[PDB]
């Protein structure tokens, strides 16, 4: 049996983080917490979710189980759950998922996990630049950039960290030195990315949440978001855009 109780904010956060890339997904309930990951059908972005058991108000299982969930459905339902509302997820039989909150009980057919596209493997990315800042700031920088290009460049060296976008008539540049960042190794890196993925990523973060960036040169970027008061960890890995002829 699986019987956990979490807050609405926590549940609404992972369903969104996930649904942003995939429609169905394998959710793993492990001894140390909830885990899940998927790659969007573009084969461009990857999201890895981890919610440690202590984040849950209650987290009971008899063994480590894996379930196939229709995320579009869970997302749709979580809109009815309130932020400060407490929600109970229950999996008694092996074919239906129960979601409780308020005076409502929602049931849904599970998907045979084996039927869902085998999840990808957690990559091994050793990268130069390491940046830790407020997700809120990052969010604003991307939004500004979004008004200029469909792509931005993440640049990094001893001077600091920079996000830049270029139009044919104007440009915009975001910049922070070690003094302003929470942590900064001054590593050297440069990569280009699509602004649209970054915005979609930022939809699950706000001011006060921590963001850790792992950046390299012409390599995927690691955006590790720590949300809901440090109760959840949502990691997005995005493939880069490549210039050529």
């Amino acid at each position: 049996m699986i019987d956990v109780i979490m807050t609405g904010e926590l549940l609404k956060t992972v369903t969104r983080a996930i649904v942003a890339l995939v429609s169905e997904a394998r959710i793993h309930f492990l001894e140390k917490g909830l885990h899940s990951r998927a790659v969007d059908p573009a084969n461009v972005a990857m999201v890895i979710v981890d919610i440690p058991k202590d984040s849950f108000e209650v987290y009971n299982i008899d063994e480590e189980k894996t379930i196939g969930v229709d995320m579009d459905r869970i997302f749709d339902i979580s809109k009815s759950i309130s932020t400060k509302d407490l929600v109970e997820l229950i999996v008694e039989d092996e074919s239906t998922l129960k979601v409780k909150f308020g005076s409502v009980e929602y049931k849904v057919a599970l998907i045979d996990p084996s039927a869902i596209r085998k999840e990808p493997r957690i990559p091994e990315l050793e990268l130069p630049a390491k940046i830790v800042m407020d997700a809120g700031e990052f969010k604003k920088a991307i939004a500004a950039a979004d008004k200029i290009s469909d792509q931005v460049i993440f640049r990094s060296d001893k001077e600091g960290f920079r996000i830049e976008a270029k139009g044919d008539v104007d440009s915009i540049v975001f910049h922070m030195t070690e003094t302003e960042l929470i942590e900064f190794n001054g590593g050297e890196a440069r990569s280009m990315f699509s602004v649209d993925y970054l915005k979609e990523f930022c939809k699950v973060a706000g001011s006060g949440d921590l963001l850790t960036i792992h950046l390299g040169t012409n390599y995927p970027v690691r955006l590790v978001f720590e949300l809901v008061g440090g109760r959840a960890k949502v990691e997005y890995i995005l493939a880069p855009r490549i210039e050529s002829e």
């Binding site: 084969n43 972005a45 990857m46 792509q151 280009m192 995005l238 493939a239």
Partner: peptide, 12 residues
């Protein structure tokens, strides 16, 4: 030009 790379170009 500008192309979008696939994620498995690196996890390969």
């Amino acid at each position: 030009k500008t192309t979008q790379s696939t994620l498995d170009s690196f996890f390969k």
